[model samples]
Target: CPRFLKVKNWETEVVLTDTLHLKSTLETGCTEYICMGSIMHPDVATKDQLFPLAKEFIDQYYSSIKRFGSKAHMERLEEVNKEIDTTSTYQLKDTELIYGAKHAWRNASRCVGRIQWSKLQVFDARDCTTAHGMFNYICNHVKYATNKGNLRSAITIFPQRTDGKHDFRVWNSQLIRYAGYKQPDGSTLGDPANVQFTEICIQQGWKPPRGRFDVLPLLLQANGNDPELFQIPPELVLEVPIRHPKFEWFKDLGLKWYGLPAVSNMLLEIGGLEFSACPFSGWYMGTEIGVRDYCDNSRYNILEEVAKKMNLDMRKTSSLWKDQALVEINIAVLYSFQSDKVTIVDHHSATESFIKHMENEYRCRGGCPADWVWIVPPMSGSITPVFHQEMLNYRLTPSFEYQPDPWNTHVWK
Candidate 1:
């Protein structure tokens, strides 16, 4: 059968530059969305009370945007207290959002990427109750348009209250969209088998998750750090919430954050296949394999190129070690199947692949798949940790506790 990759191979070098460029964009525009939204909120709301409080939420949203860069625009943010049946309520619809688009440029040594956003737009809902729908409608449009048809299409759903009064709910939910594959039975293919699912909780206002920093330990564990413990085998498997952690008390039931009225917008990132590299073999295998699975083909080839450039020692020393063959190494998606849920056993492999992908694809003209094992904080010898704050925790409280007056205490009440 024909495949997608056959038509156009994802320029490995170009793709890596794209990711690195995005990383830089997140660093700058992280606060822009929240700030812009906060500015726009005062123009539309139930009471002026949520004005200041909303600003705080906006600031938190802004901060979380960068710290949670990996999944920021992928999900939703901010909560507004709508007073149902109020005398005069101003609802804003179809607010346009714009961010600089990224483009690639070649440097003498390697290729680099740049960003420049134009303008963003959101649509209006029929009524206040439909505000969530409006928000989701616009959010989906942005995601689809920005991803350029690569990511799965999604819609946002904001929970509502029957009483017509203010309802305090965390607006969080996850909906998986599987592209390029379908089951014969017509049932949607859930996560793959043999993969473990773990819930990651990144409390709002914190840097990326805590464990992300320690790579050495994670690598060691993946390599069966403990002889007594079971070692993870490579094969088909899925890691639910592959990128961000999921919460129990969130608005929508989806990936991103925890809570109802889910504070942030629900974002669907291409995680599973995104981690794997794209194979150049043929169209069938290319589409079947995720960006992560292309390890043996695309990534390894790049590594081989880099190794030749560096002229590093590839000798194994002894007969026993000699048997260990050295081939091109790329990133592999680590899966854990502890329960019905497929959790992230740890990100050791993913991290290694990501770094190599970036270095060779953007920095070295060719990438090198180094034998970087996973370890806990403070990697031994010389490797300095690559810190990405996106994994950190940051969440907005359902209610404001500091208000002194009881009558004013429950703003959303």
Candidate 2:
């Protein structure tokens, strides 16, 4: 006899045997169970078991739309759902996909800029099967998002999962990154965050200029094909050259940063389907580039350099030289980006907006989940309102998740 199992849904427990037909009412119930269970315990389930659950989760979303009188959309959704099983292809309408993408951004607990989530521009490139086609889509996404320095949040989703085939992917963590060259003197050339990735690019026929500020190329891959690398046109990328407002000598340091930070490696999970090649971006908060990216020891490590240039006495902790230098560097980043007409938010303004977002979410959804560590800015934590508020963090579905690197999986190596 087949063993019976009981699954809990809200206040009720459902008992079922293995022979139960997963159709109609039972299909909906099984989908809720499997989708929630998989999210709650991803490591415990196999992909084969999870895929069907994901399909049902997607169907449920369409069903909800049907309930609201979207008969045409419901029919299209059902047609696509059937194609998933027969042809191994999944298609989503532009409006529906955009809705899902926006929800994913809004549900991103680590993001403090969910206030602009609904305004994101989504581009569909699901039909792209070649690495070249993927490159063109990314280029378009970057261009539109940059918007001549009035940056806008945007995303471009490439092909998603299909049975018996590999998924498409963008290998870089972000679309824009400076190359790091390991010099003979044991010093690094550019951002140390990309040292390993830079090396990987070189080993795969990339001819990096080996300069301190060289922009790394995009590494794109389609299923069953070797990764294709493409360089971003210099004109397409908007970069701000840093200069301090009060200090004339600051321009000599030649510091700079890309206008947008489009993360390309995260997996966008809608319902149960995973879009591995989705790239998304939002405007940066000043502190991200000012304090963390430029000042972090493992990254640019420009704080000590700036201190020396300012002639601060490094010997005395009482002098608060590091703090003074940090403030000046942050000021320079903000001043330069503003002068260049680029979109960036100061720490105070960003935190205030985040607090408002929390209040809005509280009124609408009863509560908001936020990661306290990420919500707090790197420089002045105690002064911000978010620093005082205790935040509750929890996992939400239809989210963007960081996945292991394709190289780490030995797919390209």
Candidate 3:
């Protein structure tokens, strides 16, 4: 979910031999060791260790602009080195920040939507100070990215890592996620994925409507202060009321999902610096909501109900009841989003597009780090070309690295 997917039984032969002799990215820059559960975080950089990485980032930026080793490029790279020598950290020019954001999106190994990597809109909010200011930026980001259903890919970078003390963060996993309320019956009323976050929201004085699919409030923390909750104005959120094209009764399920899938809790590492609170959004893949969010046992868990509505025999796995229901739910999601004019991609197209991007990556950088488990659609694995397109993952720079949830290291908890 943090754009760091794991691979199994599918590493390509090309990379299988490359791992041993692979020159460590360690000596060059800020790609860290990886895993999702019990993941690692990079230590803050010292001036001595940072100067090379600043040059590394500058080198890449210059190369992208076709100005590598130009007089202008050499001077700017030396300027960064001199500044880092004096100040321990350096500021990026706006162009560098924008390029870094888009490059990070392209380098995100887990994402299948890399075909549109160059099309990100970056909003620089490093000037944000108070929690309300952060909230204001986030709301504007949501509005722009949501675009009233014509979803856009965008990222708003909050304050960068500063002496490790003034890190900014968004407590929500995503800018838009449904609330989950604990009921007396020992059941969760909404998204089970958000139960813990919802409890934190309630603790922070959020009065919930307590309904399924209710949008959770934003929890913004600035300068490492205890996070404060701010309700997203209802009108600002664009939601699609999911219903099947062929089935009239499907509307009774009452499922709805937000158009924008903005991730808020990952660290945006560029050059030697890390921005702790850079909430980013791209439109959702259909299966992201329909297959996993709705069908997964820990999530909404509505496939069984959906199957019942379809009058499918659930008694036997051989009947392929789950598969039938899964397709319909995916269909509903795709149709609903399309009908509402929300930007989305089907699993087939998304994976197919990733393969196209993979070819481009191979032409540009020889090998692309792809977690096969993450690329293949959950419903039909063999059908998607990516399933057979052997892949390997390597940590890449200017990438979104997963961090420990802010809640885990907070004073309020």
Candidate 4:
């Protein structure tokens, strides 16, 4: 049987055989494969076959520059292409890297705050050579992105791929997460979402802090090296303690969440290069923590607890005890974050912002791709304005994509 190679460029997916030469072009002035040795399917392609794909990526990048009225440095473009052709390493200009990172956030379909996509702060850490260096860089990223109470959308791109070595990676799913310890009775002590990872850390000789919300140490690996664990300084991590405006007892629940939701595991793909360790963050939409993280059955699972505290009858389904408790929980999250002067959007405001973003994209880019399920807040799906809006979800390049965990990838023992 003949082998097929599939390359995905935005909404277009092209399947190529050994005999096929791809020459399709999009309306945005970007050209499809001029030549391909499996642009997407890297494992099957020989080293020689990879050259054309790299060159084609550069060409398309230049075309995008021209279309966007940006100055094109043809000389530098050709120089980088030559570097890629010779050493299989492509270095992007700082300006281009910044623009690509901004577009990646704009192209993120699941995110509702793409209206501020161009405001992302891009930190170029592509020269980092050790896990310790990466650790320091991440701390800096957290500090800057957190911005005290006001959060900023930011990304720090690490080194890219090379011929002999893998890219650097941060093994933790998020920069800030609570540790989960299994007790003698098999009950989890902290955030249940982190149970497996927490166990791995303990087994790797990490001393547990034995707190309900202890911050997990970072697990970083560079260039296929052994993973090194580094704990984030307690003072550097800002956390907001949950409280309700009406219910004074709500504060006694002892619930708190980190100030920023910085996702550290996803891969940031720019042009044709992949940065496996690009950590990026956005401020929280209140319901993400309240409705999903805290209320979900497998996570914090505080619905029944809160309901019992509220003196609601839980035995009767018609009592709507869960619904009532969920509203108060979400309110507590919004109120707490606001009282702490931390930047967090209520579901209603986030929905309105998303609608405005969709209109802006429709006017400027002809359409906006959005996932309805994700765009809708977990608590009140039908009540928000976004519930009435129709969205078309499509794949776009210069994107941040979720990847398998480092342990799942078997990169370390």
Best by lDDT: 3
**How well is each residue in 87-198 modelled by candidate 4, as lDDT tens digits?**
7666787877887888778877778888888788999998899999999999999999888888888889898766424658898989999998878997888898999999
lDDT of 4: 0.78
Sort the candidates on TM-score, descending order: 3, 4, 2, 1
lDDT of 1: 0.22
Q: Which ten residues in a row have the lowest lDDT in candidate 4?
A: 16-25
Global Cα lDDT for candidate 3: 0.82
Name model 2 segments beyond 4 Å from true.
Answer: 1-89
Tell me the tens digit of each residue's lDDT in model 2 across 320-397.
Answer: 999999999999999988999999999899988987787677656555556676788898788877777665555565
Q: Select the stronger candidate by lDDT from 1 and 2.
A: 2
Reference-based TM-score of each model: 0.24, 0.83, 0.89, 0.85
Q: Kindly list the per-residue Cα lDDT of model 3 for residues 1-413, writing each as its tens digit.
A: 13233233243433222231141153222235744422333257888888878888888899888998899998998888888878888999999999999988877667899888888898999889999999999889988887778778889999898876667989999988999987999998999989999999999899999888788999889998888989999999888899989999999998888888888889988898899999888888898998889999999999899999999999999999998999999999999989989899998888888877776676566556666656778888888778877676556787878788887776652
RMSD per model, one decimal? 21.0, 8.8, 5.1, 8.1
Tens digits of per-residue lDDT, candidate 1, 185-208, equal 753222221011111111212122
In model 3, the runs with Cα more than 4 Å from the true position are 1-43
**How many clashing residue pairs, candidate 4?**
0
| Index of the highest-TM-score prediction | 3
